[PDB]
């Protein structure tokens, strides 16, 4: 919760899970693919994530050990979403997070690639990108036309793919 100062030295641990708890395979996506598919991880895995944090609230202070069985399932369902999005939308998911690794991982600067990614994932994986807590009479930010905050330079691959999706009639 506080960060290490004044000569911290890092250390790691040559050990294993005990036999009591089964194997769980991990998430291997880094920040730009994780930030790219964050809304679709949240759209599919909402009741699993909320049961995990509700576990953590319910049995206070035990925490780690009494919530492992649902921390299993949140990781497995997010892995399901990520390979689902790989095998359907690999090239434009890659287009999106390759836009996102420039521009400080700001979602504000990658609108023309995220329109393509949202259209693919919505027609093929049937998951929708939504911002909750947003009452009506309020436009969502990634839908608006001519925003005030444009990026410095639009990425070339995504504006080329965006124009070709215009002329195909994809989007």
């Amino acid at each position: 919760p506080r960060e290490a100062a004044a000569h911290w030295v890092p250390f790691e641990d040559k050990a294993n899970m005990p036999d009591n708890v089964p194997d769980v395979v991990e998430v291997g996506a880094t920040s730009a693919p994780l930030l790219s598919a964050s809304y679709f991880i949240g759209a599919k895995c909402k009741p699993y994530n909320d049961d995990f944090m509700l576990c953590r609230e319910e049995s206070q202070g035990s925490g780690a050990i009494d919530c492992l069985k649902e921390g299993r399932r949140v990781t497995r369902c997010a892995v399901s979403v990520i390979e689902d999005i790989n095998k359907s939308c690999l090239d434009e998911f890659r287009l999106h997070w390759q836009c996102l690794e420039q521009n400080n991982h700001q979602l504000s600067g990658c609108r023309k690639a995220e329109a393509l990614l949202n259209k693919c994932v919505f027609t093929k994986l049937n998951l929708e990108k939504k911002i909750p807590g947003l009452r009506p009479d309020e436009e969502p930010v990634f839908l608006k036309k001519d925003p005030w905050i444009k990026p410095a330079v639009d990425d070339f691959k995504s504006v080329r793919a965006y124009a070709e999706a215009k002329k195909n009639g994809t989007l």
């Binding site: 979602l107 504000s108 911002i131 947003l134 930010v141 990634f142 005030w148």
Partner: protein, 61 residues
Amino acid sequence: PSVGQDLPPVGGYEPVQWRRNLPARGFRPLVYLAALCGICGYGFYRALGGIQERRELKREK
């Protein structure tokens, strides 16, 4: 007799300018104040619009 001196012209020189030539230039001051308030208000329009967008972007992230 007088031969070979510097003398003035037959009709004299034409008059030079010895008055103060300080013409009042510029617009009225209320024109400058109205332009100042218009520029500043348009800048506040764009600035407060951009702050509200940046807040909606923060909601997204």
